[PDB]
Amino acid sequence: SQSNRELVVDFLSYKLSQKGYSWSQFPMAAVKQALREAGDEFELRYRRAFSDLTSQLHITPGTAYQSFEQVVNELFRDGVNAGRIVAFFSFGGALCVESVDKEMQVLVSRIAAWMATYLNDHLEPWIQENGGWDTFVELYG
To answer: Where does motif BH4 map?
Structure first.
């Protein structure tokens, strides 16, 4: 999905800018504003910044896609719901932040790619069964 690359690239750019980082390294406005709002609400509750999910991953130019997939999957031990998808987006935002902090900016576009693959593969199917991106709009702000 090109519609997905876009969403991923919005949320991360949004998060990177919000927290003072560069978005250079790179979807009705409705879904986009909804994801940004969702992510913000989520992070006020859980300000851990996925501290040990990132420990298990600890991303490097070496890291393979299958590794990110193994670790993101944990968000979904109990399957998909809207909150867990927001967490997915929020977890990538955190991976990007760390990456810039670790002087690994080269990785941020790579993470965006993985997020798209993952969204297309594992999450789109739940999404279409549960109203599509519209219910994120319905649900979030």
So the answer is: 3-23
